[PDB]
């Protein structure tokens, strides 16, 4: 039938893509960066143990000033943290206590939360009322919200349980772009430093490079064996990292759209919940299910440290904009600042 | 510390005290998980214990604040949002006992009860529900008895369904669901034949929740 002919054409196109990637695979990052000086062991000590949450911390996000910090938990609380003095700036009680993601707006006036309620709720952090009031409930997704990042004060990008990512308008509650190209549950989305091409990973073991001005699956990234849980853009917007429950995390570039490096260890059999990059992109911190966060050398797939000191799984993790500190969160209701 | 720094510290202490009060209030409240295969009895059960995503419920029986999250409308991969309901005291698994003589009307090869059997097996043997008891409700007992009077149970279960009597058929099915609990020591499956007009299912949930609360208190103390 004609369905078989179209399937054959699709298979031929996939073969062409694979052949192009193989032809462009002249060398490997591991070979190219073997002569560089090893980074050495980076032992980090907890400087601030942010206590106060009373459930599993599902997500955190740093602010733009590298001091303010936002966290979410099953208790139903979004807490703004003054990481310098451990002072809780705000305590926002969520509508639904099933949050899986949170976001701090770059301007610093908005925080967004969402989860199993399928709504991305935006909270106004700066008001003459002297409190945090929900400003907009961005609804229309048919699946749980798993990652949401602000573009500006009036634009957010939302990756939901269903295969659909969304670009939203904060003011007018309509969805600007549909971002419909996945075949599974999409968990983690990243955002380029220039905010014109955001990458996202799903449960089809595939990561998608999306174009945000128009709406287009620019590139597709395969190689994982199970669902991609975490994603993070490189400091320069031409590479990104992915984490899956196959106990591996990989480096996917964009101008060659191939896997560059795979960061795996034999003793690691648990999955990865959160991944993040440091400034200069030498360190790839990843939060595993074996209760400790791991520091990987991005240029050389080799161990560089372990952020041990979390009782339960490391759910959320993030580096500051100035790179001064690493803030690591886990399911044991504790946020730790490593420096 | 400057005056503003001390005032910020005081604000943080107030926020901490509010968070502690809220956590204490929530710790004295019971989390239930309404999650079953068939949605026909789902609505009836949720409505009678009440009187686009996760729906909520809040009913107080005998000075016990209950919340029961019905998650049947998620229609997504369950392996990624079910670790959220790890602190749930009990999962109210409601299944249709009238699926006998029915073939799920969709697959036409596997019974609706047969599929719900694997759904239960997966839930009861899930990693996050190792110590979570399951309150099993077998709804549509009236339809089940009229169908068993119409025809014997052998059609749904050719492997020794038992006898044509409704009591024997229901007992055999209840055992065939109970024995799926491999961890027959940590948890305990609470089965209950509930009538459509019956109103004691809320009391049954309360009794099961009190028993599970006692069990968890026993584990929390050294007597376990």
């Amino acid at each position, epitope marked *: 039938s004609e369905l078989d002919q179209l399937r054959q054409e699709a298979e031929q196109l996939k073969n062409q893509i694979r052949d192009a990637r193989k032809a462009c695979a002249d060398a490997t990052l591991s070979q190219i960066t073997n002569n560089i000086d090893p980074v050495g062991r980076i032992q980090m000590r907890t400087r601030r143990t942010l206590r106060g949450h009373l459930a599993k911390i599902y997500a955190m996000h740093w602010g733009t000033d590298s001091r303010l910090l936002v966290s979410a938990s099953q208790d139903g609380k979004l807490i703004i943290w003054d990481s310098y003095t451990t002072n809780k700036v705000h305590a926002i009680p969520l509508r639904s206590s099933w949050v899986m993601t949170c976001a701090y707006a770059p301007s610093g006036n908005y925080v967004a939360c969402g989860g199993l309620d399928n709504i991305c709720s935006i909270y106004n952090l700066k008001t*003459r009322e002297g409190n945090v009031r929900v400003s907009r409930e961005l609804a229309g997704h048919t699946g749980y919200l798993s990652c949401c990042r602000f573009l500006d004060d009036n634009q957010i990008v939302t990756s939901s349980g269903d295969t659909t990512c969304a670009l939203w308008d904060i003011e007018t509650g309509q969805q600007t772009t549909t971002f419909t190209g996945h075949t599974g549950d999409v968990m983690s989305l990243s955002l380029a430093p220039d905010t014109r091409l955001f990458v996202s990973g799903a449960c089809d073991a595939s990561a998608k490079l999306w174009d945000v001005r128009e709406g287009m699956c620019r590139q597709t990234f395969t190689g994982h064996e199970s669902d991609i849980n975490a994603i993070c853009f490189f400091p320069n917007g031409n590479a990104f990292a992915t984490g899956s429950d196959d106990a591996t995390c990989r480096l996917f570039d964009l101008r060659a759209d191939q896997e560059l490096m795979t960061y795996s260890h034999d003793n690691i059999i648990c999955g990865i919940t959160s991944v993040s990059f440091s400034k200069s992109g030498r360190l790839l911190l990843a939060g595993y299910d074996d209760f400790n966060c791991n520091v990987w050398d991005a240029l050389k797939a080799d161990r560089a440290g372990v952020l041990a000191g979390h009782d339960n799984r490391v759910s959320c993790l993030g580096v500051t904009d100035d790179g001064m500190a690493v803030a690591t969160g886990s399911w044991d209701s504790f946020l730790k600042i490593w420096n | 510390l*400057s005056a*503003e720094d001390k005032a*910020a510290v*005081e604000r943080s202490k107030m926020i901490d005290r509010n968070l502690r009060e809220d956590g204490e209030k929530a710790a004295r409240e019971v989390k239930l998980l309404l999650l079953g295969a068939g949605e026909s009895g789902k609505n009836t059960i949720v409505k009678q214990m009440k009187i686009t995503g996760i729906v909520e419920t809040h009913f107080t029986f005998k000075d016990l604040h209950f919340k029961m999250f019905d998650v049947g409308a998620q229609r997504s991969e369950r392996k990624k949002w079910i670790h959220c309901f790890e602190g749930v005291t009990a999962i109210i698994f409601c299944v249709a006992l009238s699926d006998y003589d029915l073939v799920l009307a969709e697959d036409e090869e596997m019974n609706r009860m047969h599929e719900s059997m694997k759904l239960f097996d997966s839930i009861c043997n899930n990693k996050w529900f190792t110590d979570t008891s399951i309150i099993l409700f077998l709804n549509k007992k009236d339809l089940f008895e009229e169908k068993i009077k119409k025809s014997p149970l052998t059609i749904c279960y050719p492997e020794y369904a038992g006898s044509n009597t409704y009591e024997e058929a229901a007992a055999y099915i209840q055992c065939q669901f109970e024995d799926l609990n491999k961890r027959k020591d940590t948890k305990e499956i609470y089965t209950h034949f509930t009538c459509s007009t019956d109103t004691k299912n809320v009391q049954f949930v309360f009794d099961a929740v009190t028993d599970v609360i006692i069990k968890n208190n026993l584990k929390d103390c050294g007597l376990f």
Partner: single-chain antibody, 234 residues
Framework: DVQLVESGGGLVQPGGSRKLSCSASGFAFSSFGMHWVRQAPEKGLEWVAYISSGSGTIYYADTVKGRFTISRDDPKNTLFLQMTSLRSEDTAMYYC??????????????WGQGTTLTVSSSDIVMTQATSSVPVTPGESVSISCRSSKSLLHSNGNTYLYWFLQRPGQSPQLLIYRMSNLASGVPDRFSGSGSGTAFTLTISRLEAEDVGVYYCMQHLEYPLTFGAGTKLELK
């Protein structure tokens, strides 16, 4: 939306006792630290008391003492101020102030219209030696201020506040904590300044820029004001 109305006042017998009430609306009263600020009939402002959110810290001034008592009723959003003996120096234009304190807060954000009280017949000193300056439209004028102690704390910020008192109007916050602009204030009111002597910038002076400019330090709780700088439109 935010409104603060003062009640109680007028004429008092010597050694009298009257309570001043301030009912709030339009904002979260329980999350704001209430203040009381007096103003002599012809001289500048002066801080009176301060009650924090949650009634934790109750700090009074030195001129006023146990006679002056500040109370907060989170419910009903009422701020109170009672006195037990009214000396002749207590005749003043009392003002209420909302103050909220977190990392990037804007303390002394809002004020009130005030109430009239008339009688019947160490601390950092803010000098502001400049008294009157003739100002022309569009002319960029500068207002000076000097304290008796360095206001830059170890937290990397200084605790000098700037206020503008238009003729017949309640004081309004212009810049808080060394040139951070307030809410609803034209950007022409720039700040700039460092050390222990601090300057101001108005840039394109307009008709609304007329009035008297007041200083205040928030480093030590005595919270001393300074004599203002009237800007005569000439």
């Amino acid at each position: 939306d935010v409104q603060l109305v003062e009640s109680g006042g007028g004429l008092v017998q010597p050694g009298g006792s009257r309570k001043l009430s301030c009912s709030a609306s339009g904002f979260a009263f329980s999350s704001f630290g209430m203040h009381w600020v007096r103003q002599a009939p012809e001289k500048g402002l002066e801080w009176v008391a301060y009650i924090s959110s949650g009634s934790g810290t109750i700090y009074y001034a030195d001129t006023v003492k146990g006679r002056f008592t500040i109370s907060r009723d989170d419910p009903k959003n009422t701020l109170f101020l009672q006195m037990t003996s009214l000396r002749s120096e207590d005749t003043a234009m009392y003002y209420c102030v909302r103050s909220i304190y977190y990392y990037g807060s804007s303390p002394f954000d809002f004020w009130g219209q005030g109430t009239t009280l008339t009688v019947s017949s160490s601390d950092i000193v803010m000098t502001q030696a400049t008294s009157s300056v003739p100002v022309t439209p569009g002319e960029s004028v500068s207002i000076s201020c000097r304290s008796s102690k360095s206001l830059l704390h170890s937290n990397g910020n200084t605790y000098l506040y700037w206020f503008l008192q238009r003729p017949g109007q309640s004081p309004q916050l212009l810049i808080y904590r060394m040139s951070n602009l307030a809410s609803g204030v034209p950007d022409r009111f720039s700040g700039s300044g460092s050390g222990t002597a601090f300057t101001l910038t108005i840039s394109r002076l307009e008709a609304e820029d007329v009035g008297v400019y007041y200083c205040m330090q928030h480093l030590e709780y005595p919270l001393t004001f300074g004599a203002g700088t009237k800007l005569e439109l000439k």
